[PDB]
Structure formats: structure tokens, C-alpha cells
Paper text:
During our attempts to crystallize various oligomeric forms of the cysteine protease inhibitor human stefin B, which is used as a model protein to study amyloid fibrillation and amyloid-membrane perforation, several data sets were collected. The stefin B molecules share the cystatin fold, which is similar to that determined in the crystal structure of the complex with papain and which is composed of a five-stranded β-sheet that is packed against an α-helix. Cystatins are wedge molecules that utilize the N-terminus and two binding loops for binding into the active-site cleft of cysteine proteases. Here, we describe the structure solution, refinement and crystal packing of monomeric molecules of stefin B, which was identified as a crystal structure with rotational order–disorder packing.
Numbering used by the authors: 8 to 98
């Protein structure tokens, strides 16, 4: 289940912000992780709801490799145009 963001969630979000900014061709007035859920695969998928200013939100899908293969966090996919009350659905 989705849980409120911790500092670790903000760190994961921060590591992919530039990938998002590049794909969106803009910068964000704010980038605050608010909640997340995680999913074990071969590695771990993090789904993160992030406030990006004015009651706008983005949902991120971030892939984290297992520690032992030392690869950075990658942005697998994202959804923009989300609201504060929107469920953090898998996608």
C-alpha cells in the first residue's frame, strides 16, 4: 500500500528529476515526493507521487537495480496531470 514519502523517497525522486525535466522540456518550481509504493521485481520498482507546484502532481515509475549490480536509478515511465486526490496506481 501507498505510504507517505520519507527522505529516501525524496532522494529517489531527486535522482530522476533531471530525466523527467529532459523528457518534459521544463524545470519544476517544486519537486516534493509525497507518497510512494514499491514493488519487488528483479530489483525494485518505485512508484512515487510528487508535487510539482500549484496542486499539480506527477506519478513516477522508477527502477532500482539490485545493489550488487551498481546501476543508477532509472525513470521507467511517468504520468503527468495528476491531482492531490488521485490514487497512485501501478502503470
Amino acid at each position: 500500500a501507498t505510504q507517505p514519502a520519507t527522505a529516501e523517497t525524496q532522494h529517489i525522486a531527486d535522482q530522476v528529476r533531471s530525466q523527467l525535466e529532459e523528457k518534459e522540456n521544463k524545470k519544476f518550481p517544486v519537486f516534493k515526493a509525497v507518497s510512494f509504493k514499491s514493488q519487488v521485481v528483479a530489483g525494485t520498482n518505485y512508484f512515487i507521487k510528487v508535487h510539482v507546484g500549484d496542486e499539480d502532481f506527477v506519478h513516477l515509475r522508477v527502477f532500482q537495480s539490485l545493489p550488487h549490480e551498481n546501476k543508477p536509478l532509472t525513470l521507467s515511465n511517468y504520468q503527468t496531470n495528476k491531482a492531490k486526490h488521485d490514487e497512485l496506481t501501478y502503470f
